[PDB]
Design a protein around this ligand. Structure first.
Ligand code: HEM
Ligand code: HEM
Ligand code: HEM
Ligand code: HEM
Ligand code: VXM
Ligand code: VXM
Ligand code: VXM
Ligand code: VXM
Ligand code: K
Ligand code: K
Lengths: 156, 156, 156, 156, 156, 156, 156
């Protein structure tokens, strides 16, 4: 079913953010596991998988709309080098992600692509949950101290 | 445990091929599903997952060797536009992949990184199984004809 | 709860489309079964049942909003005489139904009937799924040939 | 128990035919598997296994009769280059085998080795079942065409 | 996947050794069973089966590498006339087998056919296990005496 | 089966390293248990058991190759006096063990003792896993602090 | 709990004997397995494990008493060259062990370390059971003859 060209462009822009997220969260996960912070590693792995599921649904919608999913262009990964900075990199990425989702939804609404809108709303819901998670972790580091926060994420 | 620098370079080169494969096989999978060729779609999905598992193990080894896994640089996806060409693109990618695995193993053997060698041998085994699969599919298209081959991959 | 007069008019228009589809899809199903294309017959039966469910929910929403659900004014059924034509007739009907759905959602949004909109969006998602199925089948007739396509739909 | 010398010679002749069939059918099975024709590969594997079981029973009977089972002399394998040739090579072998079985049964009856006869009759029943299968496959190739015939033997 | 010509020649040589072993061990098994030494017969049967499995894997690898598996040429069986001779015949055959496997592994390593090496290494492990069994049996005959050794192998 | 004299010397050297490790890790385990660091005690016990298993397999391989396994010449145990020191003493030992493993594998490869190599490679993989654990613990002492690290290892 | 200095010396002496027995019995076990005398090999393995458990308990007792368990000094292993000698070597070692146990219990009683005495008494009961086993095996070698005795220990 031939879709709106600019909608497909938005979907592909959203897909690009998810593809960045997949790799950034997967790398952070395995960095945390390597450091013995297995609870962070497992959670961040699950964030990676969730972005993979989002990318899948975007790929599928783009193909249905008879566009070409762009998996070739990979934007810049925000890889941190310690726990506090990795969380902030994830958060910075999510704030960019939600901004683009909102702009995409605006355009879907204008051209009446209500099904695409619904898909992007569902993704936006998951990304805001991720932001909640990240904001909470950063807040906890201040409340309990970095050493305790890391201690609490050694074991699953 | 600090690894050999050139070994880590090889591992990262292997990882780059797997990252290309992940996206190429995932896209082909969803293209086939979109076309109603669900048996090809499901198989190619499983090839994608297998490359994901390989990438994971490479990322983990690189981190253990105290290198930096490169998930930023994404080489060129060989995306075909019909079944015969998609299979050939996968095969062309695998023949490149196995060549690089062999060179990587040569160097691991020289510097005595026997554990890395074992990991790359296991990956090489999976990639040669994939080549077998691809060569067989291409051969079947000739034997049964394209229309029958596609018919036989409509339903799972 | 007194609803907007024109919302109810839209809902009754969508209802009218679903009533055509019920009968069109049911007849196509029984024609395919009579021809021994039992897999098409079964799938088309489930398409008819799905439209019956949408009709039910429209009738319920109209009665809640204190309108009169129009089950009396049956529009034109698009019945094919062979499989390719029947699939195309379903597609043609679905493409009108989705245009009317989008127009109804526009109006629901204007007058703030957000629950009616949500219902129409859910129905729209179904109908686009039906369009995906129908386009996929017509593409498969091309890719594998008519004789093979029909063969693959003889047995469930 | 001292058997008749000519009976033992016949049993070794039947054994020799079975040792050819074991290898011919095993190789044909693995060829069909390599080509993706896994239904033929599996069925031919089971034919090879059945010949192994016959060979076992012949070896056991020859030893009971105080003869020396000949596993050293391997006759000519009839290996085909395509499916039609392979099937016809199997059939040519089976027809030689059943001829030899009948001549061996005649001699067992003449010298009153009724147990050896009963063993050979059971093997003969198995070989006639393989001939039925082969003649049926060759006829199916004519009825449905080679492309369809190979299509139907891709999947198990 | 086109393999190295000499690797394939090596694989066919190893296949030739396995084909001798299959028949030699199968005949020894059935001789021991005929003599009432059923524990020896059973164990020797399982050695024959294990060689059959090795031969299968070699055939499959040769065909994947686009060579022709040689099941036609059958080398000399080493058949003993009593238990001690039969065990020593098996041991002589195994010592030739492992010499050939080492030479083939050398060549696989030199041309970087690492998957073929791994296959031959696994077969070599099984053959060294068989050498261990055989040397151990020959030793037990000396320790417990032949009559006791045979007594211990009457009943499974 | 007569093995290479120097292979057996290497195997006995690896064996000697495992015998030190068994005793070193067992004592460390019981020291941690006595101090109430039961999670470290349990984990170190399982490290000791794992070395016992490696020792067993080395002893078995040496006896198969007709050498004399040296369980008599116990080298120097590296016992720490506090947790950080004990972990470092384990790491120091593992780093010598892996160097000796790589030297032994070099020689096994030269004289074509591929089964001994395979055994040593499997042991090497274990030992590198142990190194990963030990480095991770020493890094965690930094990241979370000593008091927190010890606290997290009081209870299993 | 600070223990008596000479109690701790006795416990380390007992521990030293247990450490010898661990290695002597483990090597004897694996020699018997290599020779195909698997029932002896299994029983001797379990004797080695029992000494391992006694060593554990002595190490734990010494640490509780604030001593340093000596796992560094390994006394002379008594290794036989045949079954008869191996059993007698074990028995000679056990007879020195029980001597040293009795002298340690005397001292424990004198200084009122009644819990250490109870531990040593339990270990003495195990060692006297081992002496019973060993004396009985040497008696059986006489009563059934060496060939029969060895025959009865081939199979588990
Ligand atoms: C750095 C690149 C990637 C890595 C390291 C990675 C890793 C993984 C791993 C370890 C799994 C679990 C599979 C299993 O154990 O069964 C997985 C699952 C999955 N991956 Fe990835 N992946 C990567 C990229 C992608 C991409 C780019 C996509 C889609 C475009 C994707 C889609 C999926 C899906 C759909 C699943 C299944 C999740 C489920 O269980 O429902 N992955 N991935
Ligand atoms: C206003 C028009 C119709 C409405 C609102 C309607 C509604 C429904 C509903 C709600 C169901 C149950 C679906 C479920 O499983 O949850 C159903 C079932 C069914 N409908 Fe209709 N339907 C309509 C017309 C028709 C027509 C014209 C036919 C046949 C010509 C038909 C044939 C069937 C059949 C065979 C079933 C399944 C009955 C069973 O349980 O065995 N329907 N319908
Ligand atoms: C003297 C020649 C042979 C004899 C007498 C023989 C006999 C047997 C027997 C009795 C079985 C067990 C069948 C059952 O009861 O299920 C068997 C299994 C088998 N044979 Fe043979 N065989 C021979 C040659 C071969 C050859 C040349 C190959 C392949 C190169 C082969 C491959 C196999 C395989 C793969 C199995 C299945 C083993 C398993 O996984 O359990 N055999 N054979
Ligand atoms: C040559 C030296 C040794 C060898 C070859 C050896 C071998 C083994 C083996 C193979 C096991 C069984 C592992 C399994 O679960 O599969 C074991 C268990 C064990 N070992 Fe050792 N060991 C040695 C020294 C020691 C020492 C010195 C100690 C204590 C100081 C010890 C304490 C233990 C304990 C407590 C167990 C578990 C027993 C149970 O099942 O409760 N080992 N050993
Ligand atoms: O398709 C039809 N949907 C209807 O509601 C309907 C009819 N409704 C009569 C009616 C009027 C009213 F003012 C209040 C209640 C009520 O039932 C009559 C004929 C046909 C249809
Ligand atoms: O396929 C072969 N079948 C055989 O029996 C055989 C051989 N016989 C050894 C033998 C055993 C015996 F119990 C009495 C006499 C005797 O010669 C030698 C090579 C090959 C084969
Ligand atoms: O740690 C030890 N590993 C041993 O093999 C060993 C001993 N072996 C004696 C022996 C010699 C022989 F030529 C044949 C068999 C045999 O058992 C003696 C003392 C200590 C150890
Ligand atoms: O056998 C040893 N037992 C120890 O407590 C110990 C050490 N720690 C003080 C150092 C070296 C050896 C040993
Ligand atoms: K804390
Ligand atoms: K067909």
């Amino acid at each position: 079913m031939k879709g709106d060209k600019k909608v497909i462009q938005h979907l592909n822009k959203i897909l690009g953010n998810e593809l960045i997220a997949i790799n950034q969260y997967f790398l952070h996960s395995r960095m945390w596991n390597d450091w013995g912070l297995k609870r962070l590693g497992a959670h961040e792995y699950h964030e990676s998988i969730d972005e993979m599921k989002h990318a899948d649904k975007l790929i599928e919608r783009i193909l249905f709309l008879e566009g070409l999913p762009n998996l070739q262009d990979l934007g810049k990964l925000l890889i941190g080098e310690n726990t506090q900075e990795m969380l902030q990199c994830d958060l910075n990425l999510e704030l960019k992600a939600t901004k683009d989702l909102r702009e995409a939804i605006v355009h879907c609404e204008q051209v009446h692509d209500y099904v695409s809108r619904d898909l992007l709303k569902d993704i936006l819901e998951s990304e805001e949950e991720h932001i909640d998670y990240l904001e909470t972790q950063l807040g906890l580091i201040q409340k309990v101290g970095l050493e305790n926060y890391l201690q609490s994420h050694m074991h699953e």
